Amino acid sequence: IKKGDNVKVIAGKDKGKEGKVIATLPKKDRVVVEGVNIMKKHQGGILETEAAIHVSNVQLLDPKTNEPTRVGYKFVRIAKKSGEEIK
Amino acid sequence: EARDILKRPVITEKSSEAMAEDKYTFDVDTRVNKTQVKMAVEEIFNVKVASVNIMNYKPKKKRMGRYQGYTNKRRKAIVTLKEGSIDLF
Amino acid sequence: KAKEIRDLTTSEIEEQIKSSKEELFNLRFQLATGQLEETARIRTVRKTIARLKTVAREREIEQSK
Amino acid sequence: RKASTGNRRSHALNSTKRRWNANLQKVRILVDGKPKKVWVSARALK
RNA sequence: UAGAUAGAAAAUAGGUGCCCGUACCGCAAACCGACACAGGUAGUCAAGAUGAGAAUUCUAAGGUGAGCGAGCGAACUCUCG
RNA sequence: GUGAGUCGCGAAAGACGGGUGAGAAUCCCGUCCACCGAUUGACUAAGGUUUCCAGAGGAAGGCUCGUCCGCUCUGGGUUAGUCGGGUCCUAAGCUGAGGCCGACAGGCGUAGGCGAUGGAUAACAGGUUGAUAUUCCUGUACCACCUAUAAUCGUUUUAAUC
RNA sequence: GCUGUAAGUAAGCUUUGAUCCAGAGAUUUCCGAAUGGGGAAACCCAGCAUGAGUUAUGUCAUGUUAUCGAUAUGUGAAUACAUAGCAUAUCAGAAGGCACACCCGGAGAACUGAAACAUCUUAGUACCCGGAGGAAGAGAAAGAAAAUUCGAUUCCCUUAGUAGCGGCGAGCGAAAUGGGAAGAGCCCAAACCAACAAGCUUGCUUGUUGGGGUUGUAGGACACUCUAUACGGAGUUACAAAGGACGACAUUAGACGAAUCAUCUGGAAAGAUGAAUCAAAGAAGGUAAUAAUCCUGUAGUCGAAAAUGUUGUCUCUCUUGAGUGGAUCCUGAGUACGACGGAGCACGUGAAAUUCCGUCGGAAUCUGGGAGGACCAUCUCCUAAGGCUAAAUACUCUCUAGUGACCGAUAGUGAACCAGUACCGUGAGGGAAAGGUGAAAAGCACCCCGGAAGGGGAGUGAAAUAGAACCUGAAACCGUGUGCUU
Ligand SMILES: [Mg+2]
Ligand SMILES: [Mg+2]
Ligand SMILES: [Mg+2]
């Protein structure tokens, strides 16, 4: 439900980090974001592409802090905890 | 109509020699008399006499994913000419 | 392409069907030569024919009642 | 009607088993109220 | 013959002519026989000398060398003289 | 596992050379030798269903080895107015409207109809591919049919004529 | 975001709202009841009309073409009458399928028990056939019973393994009174009238409609008195007669849906440690390890353009309802009953009622007839010989939502996976084995030997003795070396 906005990945390899997302993959439920870099290899010794994680993620717009995203009233449109700006 | 009477062309070394005496080789949709092909290929290109000869083939086997299955039926029809010639290559 | 079709006469419907079929047969007939690189174009064509015959049939009904 | 009718048991003088019919009476006639023919009982033809 | 029906076509020119099957083995390695099995498997052709002869012995046509072999050359079994 | 690296390796005359290949009694090539020859030959039916041919591969299959195969992988091959058959016929037999019979099911059977191993039926020789041949081409032929054209008919009788 | 499982590549689509979800509609090749003919199922061959293309034939496109019956026609003649037949047209008729379930009916067994067996039991089971339903059957008293009588049927309990049947052995087995679930009663036939009909006896009677009328404490007819009036009404389309309008509710896609931060360990926290929060929501599952406060979610609330289903009120239809008197008539005929053989009633021919079957004989008409367990009498109760009927009940091929002191890969469906498969058999038919990498494919770049396969190294990863025949990896079995010994 996300198309390249901000997040804070909290509960994975290394946390406290943020970044912006690529394909959400609705079926596998796995998003692509800067924060994991597999050492893939083809015939280079390594490749350093970008890999995915399950949704252990959260958004942050006004508080500059993770909150439970909360799609609220119809004006649909997002309406977060403390502040209500677009997703 | 022409569409569902001519399904594919065919090319090979066989057809390559065949084009010496102005022959060609198509594959048709099945359940087509020989004659419809004549009047229809006539309809579409204006080429003609040197009537047709034709065959069938039974479907072979194949294993692509270690599961059994058969190829598809194949009715091949051999066209030959007396009146100009056709190239669509 | 849903109501471009509704703009027709019930007679032009036939001609674009035929010409679309010749367009198609050109593509199918090139296809095994390997001249073609386009793959997904054919679906658009065949689906168009489906649309034209569909609407022709619907108006065939509503010209019956 | 034309049916083996009443198919049940037949006891002997010491009551072994045996199946029978009671094949209901029917005799055929030119019917005296319609010019055709059919099996007909006697019990009706009183 | 009952009947049809005005009233043909000699020989001439020209064209029209559908579906199925067709590959391969078919006294066999591919059929039946669970096996690449010393079995059965209708039918056609079937040459040469010798011979009454499709018998027998040796050869054409043509096909095959048989899907483990090398040693020694004892018992014993089998097959032959 | 034991038995056991033991019985067996499914009648049979092969040998040599030259190549290949990482590697050859077993593969290709040739020379010799031996075998069948009313046949281990050639052609088709039933039957099986792509085993057919080319190019590669050798994990297992092949009663050994295998650089090979009827095993795998990819690709490719079967052409008919006249051939066997259907649009022609039919026996045995099967089915069988109406119909006769049977507790139901269904059983019998006329009309007709299906059903060939038989009857009738218009084609031959050569060439050609790694793989198809009376099917392709090359030449020469045939039957039915339509269309076009005229030398014979003359109430539509009878006469040509169906 | 998408182009299934099923990777991968390339071509392309998509806020001008794809894909996806739900409802309607359009298509829906061929075989199959198969239905134009034929047929070795999925092939072949035709016919007629119309219409494509040809100069013309060949060739095609669509439509149509079976049988049976049951209606309307004509036509029918073996014989004149005219029927048998014959040609044509109409029907949303039927045929078939199935859920091996549940129901009714036709037919209908044996092993077995009996300590053997023939009566018997198993059993009126199985299978077979047929029919219909979503439930069926039954059914509104020619009962039950013996009193302060009740007043369709069915099912559950109980009476009762009692009373009884029985080579009196095996064994079988009610019913009633009572307590409960559900509760519903109605139309014909007949005598009477009108109409039309052949015999018109010019006598009226039979033939067909409409009325008329439906029963035991007798009733109707017929005669008489009032109600109603084309309606005051009851109507009840689930019986009772068969048609149609218009609101509410549920179902088939969905949405909202309160709440947490940090330290240590870790490869990774959802754990320990602390301090905090929501609760109509601490059900559940997933999330790199065990989470009410990360996601899906739940409590609760909202929501349907269209379609369906059930319910409601006006339309809608359709309808007179009682009473007395009983002179005369009517109350279901080859029926009921008897005998003969049989079956079934818990009941085996027994004294054997009551009910059904076949043959044969053969009653009565309300001062009548049947039952009350042989049969007669008195008493009591009920009125066949014509028909319909919801619910209560039995089952679940299937769907929705749920659950388990149920299984967790030799169990459980035979079947967790590409199974009624491979396979076996001519054929009916019988029938297998086979789950798991890791959190994520990050699925071993690169060097080396090697023809390859395989391996040693280097690297991905916490771990590759997790490296695809991939969690854990026992015992048999096989080896390598070695302390002691022979
Ligand atoms: Mg064959
Ligand atoms: Mg042999
Ligand atoms: Mg000789």
Ligand SMILES: [Mg+2]
């Ligand atoms: Mg050599």
Ligand SMILES: [Mg+2]
């Ligand atoms: Mg119907």
Ligand SMILES: [Mg+2]
């Ligand atoms: Mg008796």
Ligand SMILES: [Mg+2]
């Ligand atoms: Mg009687």
Ligand SMILES: [Mg+2]
């Ligand atoms: Mg296990």
